[PDB]
């Protein structure tokens, strides 16, 4: 019984300043318990966004994102070479609170 | 209030087939019991093996063991198999923002 989340893509490349756009859908409603987290080889994954929309201490203004309920938008207004990186989803309304598949970003 | 802080060690770590692989993840601050152990592999959620320090989520072999309350944690794989090889991180979830240790990755000698 536990919440499934479905995040997509799996993979994608984009080139510097470009708008990047991630979502993920829970199997039910979570209300805006969801997070964003990303993720560098060889670091700990850091949470960005929670609450569907909060930002993070130091977490620029081109990261946001949105949704309620059932499916969730992050969004990079503006790729950097920073933001190279793996991001996930995570549901925290019920316990265990699941993660989707993950997004790895490249330079195109 | 800080963010927690999780001090994970080792960063990466060699050993045989069977062998007993210890890992430990220290918070900066008394967590009581909410702190998870995940495995990544690439491609993958995030995948559960003990929840609230030291509970087995369903259906995890039992070779995966976790102890500890308060600020000292122990993960334990008792047998290494060749598929376990992957990396593995501990989670606090006493307080938002949740925040990872730094990762464990493991190889076969």
């Known amino acids: 019984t536990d919440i499934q989340m479905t995040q997509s893509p799996s993979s994608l490349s984009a080139s510097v300043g470009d708008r990047v756009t991630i979502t993920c859908q829970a199997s039910?409603?979570?209300?805006?318990?969801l997070n964003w987290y990303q993720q560098k080889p060889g670091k700990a994954p850091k949470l960005?966004?929670?609450?569907?929309?909060?930002?993070?201490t130091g977490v620029p203004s081109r990261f946001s994102g949105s949704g309620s309920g059932t499916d969730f938008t992050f969004t990079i207004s503006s790729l950097q070479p920073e933001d190279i990186a793996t991001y996930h989803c995570?549901?925290?309304?019920?316990?265990?609170?699941?993660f989707g598949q993950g997004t790895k970003l490249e330079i195109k | 209030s800080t963010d927690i802080q999780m001090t994970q060690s080792p960063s990466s770590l060699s050993a045989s087939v069977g062998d007993r692989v210890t890992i430990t993840c220290?918070?900066?601050?008394?967590?009581?019991?909410?702190?998870?152990?995940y495995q990544q592999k690439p491609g993958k959620a995030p995948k559960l093996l003990i929840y609230?320090?030291?509970n087995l989520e369903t259906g995890v072999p039992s070779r995966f063991s976790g102890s500890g309350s308060g600020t000292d944690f122990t993960f334990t794989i008792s047998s290494l198999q060749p598929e376990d090889i992957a990396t593995?991180?501990?989670?606090?979830?006493?307080?938002?923002?949740?925040?990872?240790?730094?990762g464990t990755k493991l190889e076969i000698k």
């Open positions: 039910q409603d979570i209300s805006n318990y």
């Open positions: 609230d320090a030291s």
């Open positions: 995570q549901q925290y309304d019920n316990l265990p609170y699941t």
